[PDB]
Amino acid sequence: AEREFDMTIEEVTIKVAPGLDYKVFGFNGQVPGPLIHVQEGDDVIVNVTNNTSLPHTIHWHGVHQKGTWRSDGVPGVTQQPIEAGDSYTYKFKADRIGTLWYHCHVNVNEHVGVRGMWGPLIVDPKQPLPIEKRVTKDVIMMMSTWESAVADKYGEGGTPMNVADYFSVNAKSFPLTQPLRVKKGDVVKIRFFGAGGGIHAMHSHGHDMLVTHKDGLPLDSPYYADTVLVSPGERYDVIIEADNPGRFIFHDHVDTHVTAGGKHPGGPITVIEYDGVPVDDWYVWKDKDYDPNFFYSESLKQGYGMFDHDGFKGEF
Amino acid sequence: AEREFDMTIEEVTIKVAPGLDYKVFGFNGQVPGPLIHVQEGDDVIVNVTNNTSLPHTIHWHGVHQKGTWRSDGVPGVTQQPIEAGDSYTYKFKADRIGTLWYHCHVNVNEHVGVRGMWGPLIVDPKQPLPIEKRVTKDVIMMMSTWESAVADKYGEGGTPMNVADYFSVNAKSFPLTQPLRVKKGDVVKIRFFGAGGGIHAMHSHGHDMLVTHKDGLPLDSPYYADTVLVSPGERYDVIIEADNPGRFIFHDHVDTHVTAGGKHPGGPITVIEYDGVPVDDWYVWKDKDYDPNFFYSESLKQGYGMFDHDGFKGEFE
Amino acid sequence: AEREFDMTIEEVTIKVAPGLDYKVFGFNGQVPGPLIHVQEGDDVIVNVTNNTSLPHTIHWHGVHQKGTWRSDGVPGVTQQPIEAGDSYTYKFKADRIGTLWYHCHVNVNEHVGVRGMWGPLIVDPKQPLPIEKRVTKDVIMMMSTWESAVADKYGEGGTPMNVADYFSVNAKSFPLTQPLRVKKGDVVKIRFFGAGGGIHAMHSHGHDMLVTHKDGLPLDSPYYADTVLVSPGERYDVIIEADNPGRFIFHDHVDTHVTAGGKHPGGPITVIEYDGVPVDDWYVWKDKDYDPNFFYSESLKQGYGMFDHDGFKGEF
Ligand SMILES: [Cl-]
Ligand SMILES: [Cu+2]
Ligand SMILES: [Cu+2]
Ligand SMILES: [Cu+2]
Ligand SMILES: [Cu+2]
Ligand SMILES: [Cu+2]
Ligand SMILES: [Cu+2]
Numbered sequence A, C: 001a002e003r004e005f006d007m008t009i010e011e012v013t014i015k016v017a018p019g020l021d022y023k024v025f026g027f028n029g030q031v032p033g034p035l036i037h038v039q040e041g042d043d044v045i046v047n048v049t050n051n052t053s054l055p056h057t058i059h060w061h062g063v064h065q066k067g068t069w070r071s072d073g074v075p076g077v078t079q080q081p082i083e084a085g086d087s088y089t090y091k092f093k094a095d096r097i098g099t100l101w102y103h104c105h106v107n108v109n110e111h112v113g114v115r116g117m118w119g120p121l122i123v124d125p126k127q128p129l130p131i132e133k134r135v136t137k138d139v140i141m142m143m144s145t146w147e148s149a150v151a152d153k154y155g156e157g158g159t160p161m162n163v164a165d166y167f168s169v170n171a172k173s174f175p176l177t178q179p180l181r182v183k184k185g186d187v188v189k190i191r192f193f194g195a196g197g198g199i200h201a202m203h204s205h206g207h208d209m210l211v212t213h214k215d216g217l218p219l220d221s222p223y224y225a226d227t228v229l230v231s232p233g234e235r236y237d238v239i240i241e242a243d244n245p246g247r248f249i250f251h252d253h254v255d256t257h258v259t260a261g262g263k264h265p266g267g268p269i270t271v272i273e274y275d276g277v278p279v280d281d282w283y284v285w286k287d288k289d290y291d292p293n294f295f296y297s298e299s300l301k302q303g304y305g306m307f308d309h310d311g312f313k314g315e316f
Numbered sequence B: 001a002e003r004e005f006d007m008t009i010e011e012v013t014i015k016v017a018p019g020l021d022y023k024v025f026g027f028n029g030q031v032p033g034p035l036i037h038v039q040e041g042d043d044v045i046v047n048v049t050n051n052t053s054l055p056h057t058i059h060w061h062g063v064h065q066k067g068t069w070r071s072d073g074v075p076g077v078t079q080q081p082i083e084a085g086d087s088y089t090y091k092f093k094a095d096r097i098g099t100l101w102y103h104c105h106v107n108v109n110e111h112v113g114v115r116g117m118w119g120p121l122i123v124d125p126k127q128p129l130p131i132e133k134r135v136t137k138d139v140i141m142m143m144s145t146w147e148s149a150v151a152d153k154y155g156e157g158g159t160p161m162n163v164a165d166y167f168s169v170n171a172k173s174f175p176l177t178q179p180l181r182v183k184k185g186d187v188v189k190i191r192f193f194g195a196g197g198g199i200h201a202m203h204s205h206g207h208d209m210l211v212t213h214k215d216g217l218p219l220d221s222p223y224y225a226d227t228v229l230v231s232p233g234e235r236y237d238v239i240i241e242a243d244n245p246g247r248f249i250f251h252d253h254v255d256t257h258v259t260a261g262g263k264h265p266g267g268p269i270t271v272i273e274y275d276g277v278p279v280d281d282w283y284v285w286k287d288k289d290y291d292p293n294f295f296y297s298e299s300l301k302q303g304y305g306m307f308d309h310d311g312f313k314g315e316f317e
Helices: B130-134
Strands: A002-017 A020-027 A035-039 A043-051 A059-061 A087-093 A098-103 A118-124 A137-146 A166-169 A180-182 A187-194 A200-204 A209-214 A217-225 A227-230 A235-241 A247-252 A269-274 A305-307 B002-017 B020-027 B035-039 B043-051 B059-061 B087-093 B098-103 B118-124 B137-146 B166-169 B180-182 B187-194 B200-204 B209-214 B217-225 B227-230 B235-241 B247-252 B269-274 B305-307 C002-017 C020-027 C035-039 C043-051 C059-061 C087-093 C098-103 C118-124 C137-146 C166-169 C180-182 C187-194 C200-204 C209-214 C217-225 C227-230 C235-241 C247-252 C269-274 C305-307
Touching: A002 A166, A002 A305, A098 A187, A098 A235, A118 A137, A118 A187, A137 A200, A187 A200, A187 A227, A209 C217, A217 B209, A217 B217, A217 C217, A227 A235, B002 B166, B002 B305, B035 B043, B098 B187, B098 B235, B118 B137, B118 B187, B130 B187, B130 B209, B137 B200, B187 B200, B187 B227, B217 C209, B217 C217, B227 B235, C002 C166, C002 C305, C035 C043, C098 C187, C098 C235, C118 C137, C118 C187, C137 C200, C187 C200, C187 C227, C227 C235
Parallel strands: A002 A043, A035 A118, A137 A187, A180 A269, B002 B043, B035 B118, B137 B187, B180 B269, C002 C043, C035 C118, C137 C187, C180 C269
Antiparallel strands: A002 A020, A035 A305, A043 A087, A059 A098, A098 A118, A137 A166, A187 A235, A200 A227, A200 A247, A209 A217, A209 A235, A247 A269, B002 B020, B035 B305, B043 B087, B059 B098, B098 B118, B137 B166, B187 B235, B200 B227, B200 B247, B209 B217, B209 B235, B247 B269, C002 C020, C035 C305, C043 C087, C059 C098, C098 C118, C137 C166, C187 C235, C200 C227, C200 C247, C209 C217, C209 C235, C247 C269
């Protein structure tokens, strides 16, 4: 089917951690960018308007661009950049399946590294794996890093001379992340993305993960892991069988990454919270204002197209 | 079988490198912590006493805690911390097989990153791989990094603003590491752990490694490597066939990691020394003061239980 | 067969980037060092003469040194160093197949980290994979990093206290790299090397990579990837089916690595350029002064031996 979407690029500010507001270039004014969810074989048309003061593009990472290389989104290679105030239309066929993503390809070190110019592109295969047919909850986790020194400073950051001192999943640092709420018997598909410039060692307490896909494509030899290393550009899909009721923390195991501006705890941390587990008064998230779509789990159930999320929207 | 162990957490100082003494929180006053070696299906009880000035927990990394999540050892999630001077008992069934480990889960960036709060937990499968039944030597290598600026200062370190300038296997930096001594025909199982906050590219000269397990679980498709990348939290088990007599260096291939305080050589370096090879006068480790249990290989032959090692023990104040 | 080669170590200066010349110890006065290409079972002899002011060795990474451990090239372990002005002969049997490499093993943090003391060693199996039979182009990509503060001064660099601020493939930083020119129907073997001290996430636009070998040895279970993480010491061989005509960028996806001295663009970046695709006026590499052997692809067709390349030579 033909899938036509309109995206904008906006100058907005988001809250990454307590005390850290960050100026970003948000697709549809949000970080992560909108979820794009389509079927294998769909013809995609994206009309992009640049409402920022700088040039950008959108590269569709994982999309082959078979006979459509001029929609690959690389400035000086496949197109001239999209200048401030201008528009550009991308057209491609979604013939590559799985967990893909999209991001700006101008000034990548800054724009993708610290300005949040990325989002998920999920292409449903015609032939999912047997285990994928058992999935009851689909979870998107996009990891990135932030340099507090350039929080207020478009045009700076993302160099070896900068210090990445905050770390996140879906643009939040713990405790501003959200729990992953499950029920006993759930079969959870988690899609990890190396969105930023860091490496993340994602570890699930209480469960092993079956690693089923690398960069969206199914492995002939899937393998179990309790810690999955995710590096820039990569995606890994795993399955967790939710067969062990408790509260089980789930986080980046890189020691310096569980900090926020030099203090602990912070970073890419969530908790696998099973329904019906009694809540102790000392539980860190006992009074959580819950967002059920923090990992796009609700949007992933609502059909094919483009999905904004109010929780990811920044302020103008 | 029910296996009950008593462990303490102690404030001690260890020698990581020549000219680098480091204040740590050592399980039983040592880094690495004691080897815990049990069988699949055992019921494990660990009574922990905190003899330090700061709160800690023990998380059992790889242990599912099937129906025992309150023993997972995570502060503010599964328990309140073990305060200074207090005790706490962990109970869990070892139903997850393989190379596991344990570490503190309080102030992790510092306690695990630079205070040596970790040790190995080996769970023997009831049905090991055929290749594991050929093994004649079992070897534990726990890699970590150290920040010299906070060596003498509990309560600091483990942040992006600190500089990790020393590197180790089993808490020692070359030349204070020990050789891996083998003889022709040995079948060596090596278990790599990303214990600290660094990434380590472990390269064996003279041999390929058959990578057989990831995080303790056997791969359906094992593969050969001469360099295995080990990142925080991960474990890899490999097999080396010791069929090539020589002196073969075995080290972290990350260029900056073969230094110590800006000087070279240093870092996670050992040598696979074959017994039959005549020793040259210029060999760096000629007349080495040898510790046969530096990789826990002797402890791993002594049956199920918990094993301290004096080679790893630190000095009390 | 017995194959005997003569190599020197020279003090030369290479151009790594615009704004970065670098003092290096080049094998045969070039970085990367000469391609050594032999067949499984060959008896290799390399006579090395040290024409520099400092001691060196050559370690043959991946070579087992079966019955020849004294040729392993490790100072204080298998030999005393090759002192300034002296010579030394290595002899070994190439019984280990695949993508290997060689590098100095004296003061490795500096000499391999920033002085370019490395090159490729390719051992052809007597029995190649079926997949390798279809290969029409062979490509070598050796990634490394550079510290500008020590560009002029042998005896410093390669420590945690230094800043790596330039990044390269085959010792050039974009735009001084070269395109990978292919024709539709090509089957391209790419051999990635972690030659320096960095981690590199190599991402091919427009194509998936079939990962066929790890450290030169064939995987029982090959897998597709669009991003391949290459760390120090490692090699990965991949196959790309050149079935998608366009201009497709091919680069390190680690955000900070696509910079040069704090500026973007730079780093390990090439472009898969298909023959016959019209060149746009704004294409960054329009009228490029092209080197068809920048990835050793021409040398790799010339049989067994040691092959220098003028494009890699430094100046005295
Ligand atoms: Cl022997
Ligand atoms: Cu942009
Ligand atoms: Cu891409
Ligand atoms: Cu602790
Ligand atoms: Cu854990
Ligand atoms: Cu050298
Ligand atoms: Cu080697």
